[PDB]
Ligand binder design. Structure first.
Ligand SMILES: [Mg+2]
Ligand SMILES: [Mg+2]
Lengths: 96, 107
DNA sequence: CGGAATGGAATG
DNA sequence: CATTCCATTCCG
């Protein structure tokens, strides 16, 4: 029972067709968004029902992702990892 | 009109006589005081907002354009009271309709 | 104080 | 569960 957000994110990051704007970091334990504006206008509304970077980022925080602090946005969750989709089962949406 | 909750809450809080020992209008009615930060933060803030941090309250004040009123110290017996004064020109005693003019800065 | 990261909870 | 608004927290 893995939420759509996570399997879509995983597919989106992993897809080579989108790697110019969103791709795995070299060590495969975090991912990069490039050219936010382009990414928000062109990519997000193909996967989700919006075109707002801020809405995407909220979801990331809700699922426990943390920003990696350095137009290049990097995010990270330890059980969100290249080549290991089975680990998405351990990522939980934060309740209250 | 479409006034944010922060501002109507702040206005009501400052104006309420029940809270005047910790937060009240200045005599001229164009600024307000917070006394005893610690007690105010623990006992008052979480009844009106979703936290008990003075810093978080002050952040919202800055986001809506409020400025500190600067108290000048002098020498003395000069005992001081925990007293912070804030101010916005369209935030005034007895005149709630003016809140419409106070706008949040953009993030 | 204020930029920016993260959160609450109402609404979709 | 997702999306939005803007409030709260973190940290320089
Ligand atoms: Mg990709
Ligand atoms: Mg009062």
């Amino acid at each position: 029972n893995v939420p759509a957000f996570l399997t879509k994110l995983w597919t989106l990051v992993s897809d080579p067709d989108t790697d110019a704007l969103i791709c795995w970091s070299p060590s495969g334990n975090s991912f990069h968004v490039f050219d936010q504006g382009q990414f928000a206008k062109e990519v997000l509304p193909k996967y989700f029902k919006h075109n707002n970077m801020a809405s995407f980022v909220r979801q990331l925080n809700m699922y426990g992702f943390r920003k990696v602090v350095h137009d290049d946005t990097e995010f990270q969750h330890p059980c969100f990892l290249r080549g290991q989709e089975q680990l998405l089962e351990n990522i939980k949406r934060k309740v209250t």
